[PDB]
């Protein structure tokens, strides 16, 4: 594949800092390019973790898998440390489109089996049923 961590074996110190109101799910793309879930971070918390150079990380909402930003981007790759200073991965809420934010709220209020009992266009049923997932966004990143 393309989006996959590199088995560098070069230690790199990182602080996952959750600066979002969401419960954050750290996801490590293993050397095969397959996402691997890691322990979650509650909102407003930070943990000093041990990763390695060239390893790919992405961050999601633990409950909804909504995409989150890290250091203003989507993918975070640790770099070699300098002066014993850790690398800060600042996880932040994106500025969602109004539509995507609307879909998030609706998805949390209506059971998925009852999406199609709402008074909306059929095109919105498909949008509501198109839940965010890591595999979806990896396809976008690989092709670019």
């Amino acid at each position: 594949p393309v989006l996959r961590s590199v088995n560098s074996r070069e230690p790199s110190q990182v602080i996952f800092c959750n600066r979002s109101p969401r419960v954050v799910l750290p996801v490590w793309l293993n050397f095969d390019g397959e996402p691997q879930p890691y322990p979650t971070l509650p909102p407003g918390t930070g943990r000093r973790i041990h990763s390695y150079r060239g390893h790919l990380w992405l961050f999601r909402d633990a409950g909804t898998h909504d995409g989150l930003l890290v250091n203003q981007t989507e993918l975070f790759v640790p770099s070699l440390n300098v002066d014993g200073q850790p690398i800060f991965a600042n996880i932040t809420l994106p500025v969602y489109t109004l539509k995507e934010r609307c879909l998030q709220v609706v998805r949390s209020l209506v059971k998925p089996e009852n999406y199609r009992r709402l008074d909306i266009v059929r095109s919105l049923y498909e949008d509501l049923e198109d839940h965010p997932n890591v595999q979806k966004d990896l396809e976008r990143l690989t092709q670019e």
Binding site: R19, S20, P21, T92, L93, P94, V95, Y96, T97, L98, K99, R101, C102, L103, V105, V106, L109, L118, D119, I120, V121, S123, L124, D127
Partner: protein, 88 residues
């Protein structure tokens, strides 16, 4: 430079043109003078859309911590339909 957005029930919302152009649909409509009338969007929904424009412009390309944009359950569906039509 301001633009007036008028809801279906008669309420009038005056917002900056920059904020209004967040919506691709409004941009085409804007180009009366600097006035747009929405026939399907009630006032309680159009008021929340303008809050999104202010929220969108405020926290876009900013290092300040981004807060959650609040959407009450009562207005969730109507905002979704307005958002889908407005492409914002």
């Amino acid at each position: 430079m301001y633009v007036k957005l008028i809801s279906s029930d008669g309420h009038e919302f005056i917002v900056k043109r920059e904020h209004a152009l967040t919506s691709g649909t409004i941009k085409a409509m804007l180009s009366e003078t600097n006035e747009v009338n929405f026939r399907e969007i009630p006032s309680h929904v159009l008021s929340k859309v303008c809050m999104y424009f202010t929220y969108k412009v405020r926290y876009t390309n900013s290092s300040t911590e981004i807060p959650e944009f609040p959407i009450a359950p009562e207005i969730a569906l109507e905002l979704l339909m307005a958002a889908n039509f407005l492409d914002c």
